[PDB]
Structure formats: structure tokens, C-alpha cells
Amino acid sequence: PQITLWKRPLVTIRIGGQLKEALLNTGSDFTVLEEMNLPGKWKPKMIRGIGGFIKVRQYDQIPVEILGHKAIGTVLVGPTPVNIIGRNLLTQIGMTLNFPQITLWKRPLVTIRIGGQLKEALLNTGSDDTVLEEMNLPGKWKPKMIGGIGGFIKVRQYDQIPVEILGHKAIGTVLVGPTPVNIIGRNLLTQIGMTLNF
């Protein structure tokens, strides 16, 4: 199958007869499910994203059915808005990014060109928007706030910025602010014709 990035790549998953909506997230090393009871031992862990860290419980060897595929591996449980299917399980069910083909065994980091500069950024199907670490871009910008861990984070919003990604030109909105990693979100992934596929 093929899954478009026009919208959030949400899929219903099932864990032990519990059915939950989850986001297919190439920007996530791990799978993070909203608070639920799971059987077995777990250990506390801290995971990072935009906004900071949240404390989760790490359960190993949890079966998760995803679009008719059986994944089994580590599931982190904690206070998240959206169930996130990360690369640990995506790789197991054979998910790839395509536009050529990019596998998910490693972080899907690519070189982009923006403002004459080369930067490394993460292809992130779990992000609506493209967010870069602090830099100077030419043009007007608007103050914007985006939702993070612990609350809203302040960013600068630049519109109609040319970005070259994997030999493809995009022109679109780039947010600049305190992200742990440069992320290419669905706004630009769609422009370069990226889809998720098994």
C-alpha cells in the first residue's frame, strides 16, 4: 500500500483488543502510546521532543497490530496527545519513505540547502510543519507559537522560503526555534512528492 502525506498519517492500531488511533512517525525513534495499562514489567525512561522531555514507562515485547501487520517490540507509555508509531515498529512492518526509496532502520536525515547553507534535517511524517534550529533567514517573519511538551514554544514563521531537499525544490513555510533536531514536516514533504509505503 501507499499512504499520502496531505493529511496526518493516522492509522488505527490494536493492542490486546484495545483499538487506538496512532500517527506514523518517521521522526520518532520509538513508539509512544497514550496512557494505558499494559501487562508486564516496565522501567521509567525520559524521551525528548520539541518543548523538552516527558517521563514514560518502557514495556518490551508488546504486540501491536498495524494495518494488518504484527509488530512486536518496545512501547513507551506516557502522557502523549497522539499515539506515535516510531521507527522501531515501522521498520518491522516494512514501511519506507518514497518519492527513490528511504528505509527507516536509521534516522532519515538528509542534507538540505536553505539560504545558501547546507544543514542536516530529519524527514518527519509526524510533523505538520518544518522547524529549524536558530538561524537567520531573509524576509518578514511573524511570531508564532507551536505546541510542544509542557506547553507552547515560541518560533519565528517565515513564508515562501526556498528549500532544496534530496534534489527537489520546495518553496514554503519554515519555522525557526528551539527544536532538538531540524525537521522537515509534511508541508514540505508533500511538495517534494514523498509518500509512506510498505
Binding site: L23, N25, G27, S28, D29, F30, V32, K45, I47, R48, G49, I50, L76, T80, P81, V82, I84, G86, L122, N124, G126, S127, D128, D129, V131, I146, G147, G148, T179, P180, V181, I183, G185
Partner: peptide
């Protein structure tokens, strides 16, 4: 783990 989600 780095878990990058953004809305």
C-alpha cells in the same frame, strides 16, 4: 529516544 511530533 528522540520522538519528534508537531501539530
Amino acid at each position: 529516544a528522540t520522538i519528534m511530533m508537531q501539530r
